[PDB]
């Protein structure tokens, strides 16, 4: 007899891994740029005048990773 | 006799991995740009004058990854 | 007789690994840039004039990793 | 003999008291206000939540004022 | 014989009392206000939450004032 | 014989009392205010939470004032 019974009888409850509200509220801002003879070759990545706001939220939560084997 | 019975009887309840409200409210802004003789030749990525707001929310939740094997 | 029975009878409850509200509130700002003869040749990564705010939240939570094996 | 000859032979030339260009360029902005039980009774002047930009240029120009009399 | 000859043979030239360009460029901003039970009774002047920019230029120009009299 | 000849042969030239360009460029800012039971009774002048920028330029220009009299 070969018998294989992985259960995972599990509970994740009552606000266990939440985030709150997400508010992104920029207060305006000002930018001015003057550029003349500028010259770019192979694979240049350039950002000359910037006023930049990022809210990035890949997180929170109840991440579970599991693996089983049984091998002959 | 070969018998395989993985169960996964599991419970994720009551705001367990929720997000709140998502609010993005940019307060306007101002940008001015002057460019004269510029020249770009190969794979150039450029951003000269910018006022930029990004809200990115790929997260939250209860991500579960599970794998089972049985081999001869 | 070969018998495999991993259980994982677990409980994660009541704000166990939650984050509060996420507020990103930039207070405006000011940027000015003047560029004359600049020249970039190979794989150059450049950021000349910037006022930059990043809120990055990939963390928080109840991360669990587990692995089981049985081999002959 | 009574005689009265006030002349004023005067010259005001070539940008003598001029202004340049006037530019008013607000970069946006953000305001939030919550008021519950407030009460005002007599000649009250109030400004609770404000984001305000004033450009006031009451000068410039060629205003001339002159008055003449001769009395017995 | 009574005679009165005030001349004022005067010259005001070539940018003599000029102002340059006037630029007012607010870079945005952020304000938040919460008020519960406040009470004002007589001639009260109040400014609770403010982000305020004033550009006031009452000068410049060619203002001339003159007065003449002759009395018996 | 009675005579009165004030001449005023005067010259004011070539940037003699000029001002340059006037630039007012606020760099944003942030204000937060919380008020519970405050109470003001008579002629109160109040400023609780403020971020204030004033550019006041009352000079410059060619202001001339003159007065002449002759009395018996």
Residue numbers in the entry:
A (entry chain A), B (entry chain B), C (entry chain C), D (entry chain E), E (entry chain D), F (entry chain F): 307 to 378
Sentences from the study reporting this entry:
The assembly of tau into amyloid filaments is a hallmark of Alzheimer's disease (AD) and other tauopathies. Cryo‐EM revealed the existence of disease‐specific tau folds, which are challenging to replicate in vitro. We studied three full‐length recombinant 0N3R tau forms (the wild‐type and the C322A and C322S variants) using an RT‐QuIC assay with brain homogenate seeding.
C322A tau formed filaments resembling AD paired helical filaments (PHFs) but with a more open C‐shaped core. C322S tau yielded structurally distinct filaments with an ordered C‐terminal region. Both mutants seeded further aggregation, whereas the wild‐type showed poor reproducibility and mainly unfolded aggregates.
